Nucleic acid binder design. Structure first.
Ligand SMILES: [K+]
Ligand SMILES: [K+]
Ligand SMILES: [K+]
Ligand SMILES: [K+]
Ligand SMILES: [K+]
Ligand SMILES: [K+]
Ligand SMILES: [K+]
Ligand SMILES: [K+]
Ligand SMILES: [K+]
Ligand SMILES: [K+]
Ligand SMILES: [K+]
Ligand SMILES: [K+]
Ligand SMILES: [K+]
Ligand SMILES: [K+]
Ligand SMILES: [K+]
Ligand SMILES: [K+]
Ligand SMILES: [K+]
Ligand SMILES: [K+]
Ligand SMILES: [K+]
Ligand SMILES: [K+]
Ligand SMILES: [K+]
Ligand SMILES: [K+]
Ligand SMILES: [K+]
Ligand SMILES: [K+]
Ligand SMILES: [K+]
Ligand SMILES: [K+]
Ligand SMILES: [K+]
Ligand SMILES: [K+]
Ligand SMILES: [K+]
Ligand SMILES: [K+]
Ligand SMILES: [K+]
Ligand SMILES: [K+]
Ligand SMILES: [K+]
Ligand SMILES: [K+]
Ligand SMILES: [K+]
Ligand SMILES: [K+]
Ligand SMILES: [K+]
Ligand SMILES: [Mg+2]
Ligand SMILES: [Mg+2]
Ligand SMILES: [Mg+2]
Ligand SMILES: [Mg+2]
Ligand SMILES: [Mg+2]
Ligand SMILES: [Mg+2]
Ligand SMILES: [Mg+2]
Ligand SMILES: [Mg+2]
Ligand SMILES: [Mg+2]
Ligand SMILES: [Mg+2]
Ligand SMILES: [Mg+2]
Ligand SMILES: [Mg+2]
Ligand SMILES: [Mg+2]
Ligand SMILES: [Mg+2]
Ligand SMILES: [Mg+2]
Ligand SMILES: [Mg+2]
Ligand SMILES: [Mg+2]
Ligand SMILES: [Mg+2]
Ligand SMILES: [Mg+2]
Ligand SMILES: [Mg+2]
Ligand SMILES: [Mg+2]
Ligand SMILES: [Mg+2]
Ligand SMILES: [Mg+2]
Ligand SMILES: [Mg+2]
Ligand SMILES: [Mg+2]
Ligand SMILES: [Mg+2]
Ligand SMILES: [Mg+2]
Ligand SMILES: [Mg+2]
Ligand SMILES: [Mg+2]
Ligand SMILES: [Mg+2]
Ligand SMILES: [Mg+2]
Ligand SMILES: [Mg+2]
Ligand SMILES: [Mg+2]
Ligand SMILES: [Mg+2]
Ligand SMILES: [Mg+2]
Ligand SMILES: [Mg+2]
Ligand SMILES: [Mg+2]
Ligand SMILES: [Mg+2]
Ligand SMILES: [Mg+2]
Ligand SMILES: [Mg+2]
Ligand SMILES: [Mg+2]
Ligand SMILES: [Mg+2]
Ligand SMILES: [Mg+2]
Ligand SMILES: [Mg+2]
Ligand SMILES: [Mg+2]
Ligand SMILES: [Mg+2]
Ligand SMILES: [Mg+2]
Ligand SMILES: [Mg+2]
Ligand SMILES: [Mg+2]
Ligand SMILES: [Mg+2]
Ligand SMILES: [Mg+2]
Ligand SMILES: [Mg+2]
Ligand SMILES: [Mg+2]
Ligand SMILES: [Mg+2]
Ligand SMILES: [Mg+2]
Ligand SMILES: [Mg+2]
Ligand SMILES: [Mg+2]
Ligand SMILES: [Mg+2]
Ligand SMILES: [Mg+2]
Ligand SMILES: [Mg+2]
Ligand SMILES: [Mg+2]
Ligand SMILES: [Mg+2]
Ligand SMILES: [Mg+2]
Ligand SMILES: [Mg+2]
Ligand SMILES: [Mg+2]
Ligand SMILES: [Mg+2]
Ligand SMILES: [Mg+2]
Ligand SMILES: [Mg+2]
Ligand SMILES: [Mg+2]
Ligand SMILES: [Mg+2]
Lengths: 51, 96, 78, 16, 64
RNA sequence: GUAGCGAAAUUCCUUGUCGGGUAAGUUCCGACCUGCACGAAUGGCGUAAUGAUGGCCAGGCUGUCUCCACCCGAGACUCAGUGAAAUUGAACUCGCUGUGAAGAUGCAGUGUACCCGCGGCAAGACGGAAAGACCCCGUGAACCUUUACUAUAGCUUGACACUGAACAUAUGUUCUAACGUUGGCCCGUGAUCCGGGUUGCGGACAGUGUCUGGUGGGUAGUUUGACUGGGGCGGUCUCCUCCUAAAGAGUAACGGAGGAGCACGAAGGUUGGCUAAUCCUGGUCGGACAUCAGGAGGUUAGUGCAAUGGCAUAAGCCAGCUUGACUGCGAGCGUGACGGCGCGAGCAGGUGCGAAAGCAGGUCAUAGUGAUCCGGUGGUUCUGAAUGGAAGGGCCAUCGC
RNA sequence: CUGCAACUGUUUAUUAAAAACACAGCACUGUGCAAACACGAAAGUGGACGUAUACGGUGUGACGCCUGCCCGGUGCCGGAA
RNA sequence: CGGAAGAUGUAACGGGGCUAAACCAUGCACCGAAGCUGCGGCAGCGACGCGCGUUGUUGGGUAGGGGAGCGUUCUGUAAG
RNA sequence: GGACCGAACCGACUAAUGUUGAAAAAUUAGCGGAUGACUUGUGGCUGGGGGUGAAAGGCCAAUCAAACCGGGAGAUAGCUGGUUCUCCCCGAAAGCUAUUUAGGUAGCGCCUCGUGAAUUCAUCUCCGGGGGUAGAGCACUGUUUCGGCAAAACCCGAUGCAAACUGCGAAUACCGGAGAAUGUUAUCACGGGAGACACACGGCGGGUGCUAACGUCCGUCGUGAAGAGGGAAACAACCC
RNA sequence: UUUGUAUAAUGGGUCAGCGACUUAUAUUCUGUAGCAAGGUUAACCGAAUAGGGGAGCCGAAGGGAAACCGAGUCUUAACU
RNA sequence: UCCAUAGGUUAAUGAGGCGAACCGGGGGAACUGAAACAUCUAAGUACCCCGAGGAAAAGAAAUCAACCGAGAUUCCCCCA
């Protein structure tokens, strides 16, 4: 039980977020993925934030 | 509700929703009820006098249920699309 | 003394659900299996857990094809 | 070993 | 005296047209990150109480 | 762990060993020390006297006994009078061997036995008596304990109130007028109560109220699991894989064996490519085994982690580009008592890889988990207790113990 | 001859009289008097018409010879920057 | 056939007894149940014709479900 | 003089008796104290989580780890017992799952009553299926015995063993389709009412145990349970 | 009461008398009667088992957490 | 203690005690239910105490309502 929960927040400023987990020791760099934002209905960049 | 000690059904399921106060003072009127008022003017007060809706009802909707033969003037009530057709077909008119 | 055993898992109800000649609707599970003891033939799909399911209405048909003598399940559109 | 206690008396009760 | 509603049951079940009951699914309050989206999406809509359970529900909600 | 004591009111082994006593002594007395597990005021060691106190020995004495006999009285027994009790399904109520809710008057087979009293005896009627006190069980009870849980009287701390004035630098000293007095004297008064008066002594202290931290078995209410070849002790309790399991599914035991309570932004997606172990032969350092070449071999390898089923079109290995580990849904189906859990073509939106057909809603598959309530965070074309707002509630997403 | 308790006492009315309780003696400790302490929402009362050679609590248990080491734990006492 | 000992009494064919009245084989007779058939009767369910007839079939039961009744006291019918 | 012996008086160490007693604690013979921390009369005070206790949880009106009387009160009792007239029809279960659950209870299964929809369901025949059991085998995973070749293993042979071995593999069973005949509609759905969730033995397939148990735990069928009659001397569960 | 009792498991000495599924209200289902897209009144008034009293209640519409829409509605940007 | 006050004496008037329920107020359980139990329940019940009357208590809006309005208290039926 080392992987901590994180939220990936939309860059579209919709407030929509996905959640996932992350090994913060091994991979300290912030996760950044293009994901579908259903509010704007577009693939936008999602960036890591605190759960 | 007791099931021998197993979490009962009404406890293992989540609560949901809230109760509207506005719903309590809202009523539905059938077309069949429009003929039961006195004068041929269906308003909130004539519906109450005719014992169609309760005394504390503030809002009422006429819905397409039953038939309306006579012409009636509906005043102040909401009316469904289907009910509007039926009332106007019977020679009535809907006043906002 | 005592025992160090005494454990097992729930039975998973695997196996053939629809046998040869049975008429199935599309979507119907034909076999539940760990790994592909049977392989998907015509009009049969393989799910992520290697469940074989009908992709069309028809009759289930088992058949052995190939040099390895692999068991295929297919749906004969009927 | 013994399977019974040695017999004892009961307390007095109004008899009838 | 009047039968009393089990008030907790009345907050969890609502009677439908043909006289069944709808309820919200369990398992969508928390610990959501680990659950598949498909699983969660299927828990969102209200479901109907099953045959085995109706008797229990009806007993709890005499004025439903 | 000293002095002292020690097989002891303490020594399990143990009737320890040695000595004394007896014909013979698991007890007794004296020692030894190997004190299972003595030991100094929950006192150590001694100790005259005392004891309806525990142990052992001897003299005397004896019907305690060898082994009983006889006798005197009171009953027993018979007659007259009076006249209970426990118990009791019904009885025409024998032995034996077998049978059988497994120890028979009552069943089977068989043996024996004319009907009925009276005195006696207690082997049986699982005799009478008391809904077993042992043992277990009940989400019974009581009382007791404590560093069980939760409270709480009491004790204690500070804040505010009753409670004031000077002075010096929140703290101290001084003051008197609140307040205290279980000091003295006077009066009510014939009164060691009480009140008033005068005076002294304390004095804003003490003390009391409200609030507050600590302490609190002093007291109270309670809790203190289940399974179990009785209970306890031990073990176990959810999930995954195999076997038991009787060639569909399912299938028990405190049956036989192992695992889980995760990992991974690549170990996911896609496109293109690729194919193992082991051994043999030769070769710098180089050896049984490193890397190189060829041959045999044919998956005996590999698969993030158990086991099983799978895997070459690889699900195994390598590289490029990526975020489908998408959002809304879902014909149909599997599996559960239910809560639930699982598989899923296809449809819409938007995406990645590929020339394209296509493939992609995580991972070869099956473990890696937890309902509800209460609460948190973000969003919201819902609600908003006269009205506009807002709080609060709902809905969607998500989190916590 | 010997265990235990010094002794006289006390005790389970109704299965235990004892080696148990008490005891004189010993020690520790609290208590300055409106005493500590106890009964009592309180007033009061006992302690005591007593005053540390007194009173309460606790342990030990005549007498003789004696009563060793440990203050880490728990309590109590004291300190306070 | 021996191997082969147990406690109240034969007591390890139920007994008497048996040399078959034992065992094996084959056969035919008979006995034997509340089974089956015969005769008479009752009831349930269903056909079939018009409540009745004809006919098939069914009728062991604990928990328990369903159906139909008896009788008791009291009220009306009953100042009968 | 809490001194000695010993009556009264106060106690209560031993034994016998008595034990539906003469007596709900005594009698008889012995026994301890007997100027004291003695004993006794009369009156008084202490009250129930309270008293009082030279301490035994003793005693507080024959009652004491919380008196007695009345009340809350018909406390609660998942436990035991008991539950009253008649006839007719059908007729279980002693399983699964969950449970501070295990002798309780709940959903489901099994019973009954009612309503509704199918030539629904069952038996047999034929047809289409998957199987990995019995058996067998030994390439595989392990195990085993002996040989022939060799730096004494492999290679080359012979021989066994396996619940957790399979290069093989039945009978049955199960799923589906078609067809006849027969059957109390026996199948399915919904609704009213349950009971039951201690099972027993016998056969067959097994785990466990000693291929011990009238043992224990599963599967499956039968009987008992809830079933009388005949047989097995007698004998729920065996035979008819 | 039990898997199972002649059981040596429980209970009853016998007789007579008494002794255990009730009552109220709510709710659901069945039967039956009335009326029927309607049905029915409560308290109360009334000398009135009449009559009045329709306050109410149930039903004739649902969907949605809700606003709201309505033979549809919810879900969704939108549904095959 | 100088006035005074406390105190004292006499007179007049009244009170006290009892009572089945009902009523207002001061105190106030536990068993029990929650299938244990502590919040909660039982229940402001039982019980104790004080007071009062033929009744008691309550009562004449610093009340509701919802932009329309109502018009003290008490009791009954609804709302539920
Ligand atoms: K010794
Ligand atoms: K010792
Ligand atoms: K001590
Ligand atoms: K001493
Ligand atoms: K003595
Ligand atoms: K006989
Ligand atoms: K005889
Ligand atoms: K006898
Ligand atoms: K003064
Ligand atoms: K002060
Ligand atoms: K305490
Ligand atoms: K067992
Ligand atoms: K046993
Ligand atoms: K990849
Ligand atoms: K890749
Ligand atoms: K002695
Ligand atoms: K001594
Ligand atoms: K004595
Ligand atoms: K004592
Ligand atoms: K210490
Ligand atoms: K210390
Ligand atoms: K006296
Ligand atoms: K008491
Ligand atoms: K008494
Ligand atoms: K059940
Ligand atoms: K039913
Ligand atoms: K082999
Ligand atoms: K069996
Ligand atoms: K039968
Ligand atoms: K029994
Ligand atoms: K008995
Ligand atoms: K009813
Ligand atoms: K009706
Ligand atoms: K629709
Ligand atoms: K309580
Ligand atoms: K309970
Ligand atoms: K309890
Ligand atoms: Mg109305
Ligand atoms: Mg398995
Ligand atoms: Mg949520
Ligand atoms: Mg010795
Ligand atoms: Mg010796
Ligand atoms: Mg001798
Ligand atoms: Mg000695
Ligand atoms: Mg000692
Ligand atoms: Mg010392
Ligand atoms: Mg000491
Ligand atoms: Mg001593
Ligand atoms: Mg006589
Ligand atoms: Mg016998
Ligand atoms: Mg005789
Ligand atoms: Mg005798
Ligand atoms: Mg007896
Ligand atoms: Mg008993
Ligand atoms: Mg306690
Ligand atoms: Mg309690
Ligand atoms: Mg247990
Ligand atoms: Mg199987
Ligand atoms: Mg099988
Ligand atoms: Mg089974
Ligand atoms: Mg992978
Ligand atoms: Mg507002
Ligand atoms: Mg407001
Ligand atoms: Mg000795
Ligand atoms: Mg003594
Ligand atoms: Mg003495
Ligand atoms: Mg005694
Ligand atoms: Mg005695
Ligand atoms: Mg002592
Ligand atoms: Mg003999
Ligand atoms: Mg016959
Ligand atoms: Mg017959
Ligand atoms: Mg006949
Ligand atoms: Mg019959
Ligand atoms: Mg019958
Ligand atoms: Mg003397
Ligand atoms: Mg005495
Ligand atoms: Mg005497
Ligand atoms: Mg004397
Ligand atoms: Mg004791
Ligand atoms: Mg007494
Ligand atoms: Mg008590
Ligand atoms: Mg009560
Ligand atoms: Mg009772
Ligand atoms: Mg029958
Ligand atoms: Mg639980
Ligand atoms: Mg075999
Ligand atoms: Mg059970
Ligand atoms: Mg059982
Ligand atoms: Mg069984
Ligand atoms: Mg067997
Ligand atoms: Mg058995
Ligand atoms: Mg056996
Ligand atoms: Mg039974
Ligand atoms: Mg029979
Ligand atoms: Mg028979
Ligand atoms: Mg017979
Ligand atoms: Mg038994
Ligand atoms: Mg019998
Ligand atoms: Mg008998
Ligand atoms: Mg009997
Ligand atoms: Mg009994
Ligand atoms: Mg009896
Ligand atoms: Mg609606
Ligand atoms: Mg409770
Ligand atoms: Mg009066
Ligand atoms: Mg008044």
């Amino acid at each position: 039980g080392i992987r901590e929960k994180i939220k990936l927040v939309s860059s579209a400023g919709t407030g929509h977020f996905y959640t996932t987990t992350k090994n913060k020791r091994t991979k300290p760099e912030k996760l950044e993925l293009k994901k579908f934002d259903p509010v704007v209905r577009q693939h936008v960049i999602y960036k890591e934030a605190k759960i | 509700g007791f099931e021998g000690g197993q979490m009962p059904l009404y406890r293992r399921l989540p609560k949901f929703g809230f109760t509207s106060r506005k719903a309590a003072i809202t009523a539905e009127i059938r077309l069949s009820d429009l003929a039961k008022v006195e004068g041929g003017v269906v308003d909130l007060n004539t519906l109450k006098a005719a014992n169609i809706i309760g005394i504390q009802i503030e809002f009422a909707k006429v819905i397409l249920a039953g038939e309306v033969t006579t012409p009636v003037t509906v005043r102040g009530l909401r009316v469904t699309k289907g009910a509007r057709a039926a009332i106007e077909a019977a020679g009535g008119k809907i006043e906002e | 003394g005592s025992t160090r055993n005494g454990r097992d898992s729930e039975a998973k109800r695997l196996g053939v659900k629809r046998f040869g000649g049975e008429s199935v609707l599309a979507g119907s599970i034909i076999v539940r299996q760990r790994g592909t003891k049977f392989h998907a033939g015509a009009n049969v799909g393989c799910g992520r857990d290697h469940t074989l399911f009908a992709k069309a209405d028809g009759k289930v048909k088992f058949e052995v094809k190939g040099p390895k003598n692999r068991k295929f399940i297919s749906i004969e559109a009927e | 070993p013994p399977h019974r206690p040695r017999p004892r008396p009961l307390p007095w009760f109004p008899p009838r | 005296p009047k039968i009393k509603t089990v008030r907790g049951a009345a907050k969890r079940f609502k009677k439908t047209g043909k006289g069944g009951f709808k309820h919200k699914h369990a398992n969508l309050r928390h610990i959501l990150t680990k659950k598949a989206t498909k699983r969660k999406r299927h828990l969102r809509p209200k479901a109907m109480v099953s045959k085995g359970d109706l008797g229990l529900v009806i007993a709890c909600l005499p004025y439903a």
